[PDB]
Amino acid sequence: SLALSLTADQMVSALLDAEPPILYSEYTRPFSEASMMGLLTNLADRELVHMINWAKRVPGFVDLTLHDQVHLLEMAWLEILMIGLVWRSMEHPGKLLFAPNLLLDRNQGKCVEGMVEIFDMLLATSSRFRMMNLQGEEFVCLKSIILLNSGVYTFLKSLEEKDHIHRVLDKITDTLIHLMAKAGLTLQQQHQRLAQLLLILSHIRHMSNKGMEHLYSMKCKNVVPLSDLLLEMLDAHR
């Protein structure tokens, strides 16, 4: 497999070039509950198509069966959207950068019921990334870890491919450490920082889970129009 033979620099280079583009919202208008979710769902939907082409460029992902690829994306897609949103919002304290033309302050989250709670969690993650001075090279590693990890414990011959995803995860871990060594961190600082980064993934999982239950509550309560693809993605967490 190509992924296991890569160097750490080649791994970072691959992940950097695989990055999806930043898209614009279909945002002169006043906001309301149906309006804002409209914007968010249309944006999410377009980001999803680019995410799939990005996943196929994460080293290791192509080696997996379509079943396994489908399963990892179904578990991971909202976590990936959210870590993306957080990353983009790093340098905007107090605000969420959904798109270059869609920068939403905290209060604007009250437009949708229960959504300000999700905003707050996202803002706190962003603030955390800001304090750690998260680097872009580290961010694309974290996003790859989320993809491969968030579905892995949720799986005869299939033992050989869980084992493959775990070899890839170790390589990404090796890559994070490489990046930290290159930045001059001490050995003790490298372990500590690695742990800080992975523990934020637990909070990202928490946010996805709470987010999904809100979205699962508005696929029932038939309000905003959901595209076929989001509808499918949503029913995986049934």
Partner: peptide, 13 residues
């Protein structure tokens, strides 16, 4: 193989 996600994961680029 009938999910949209299925369909997208083969004709990617």
């Amino acid at each position: 193989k009938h999910k949209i996600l299925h369909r997208l994961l083969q004709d990617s680029s």
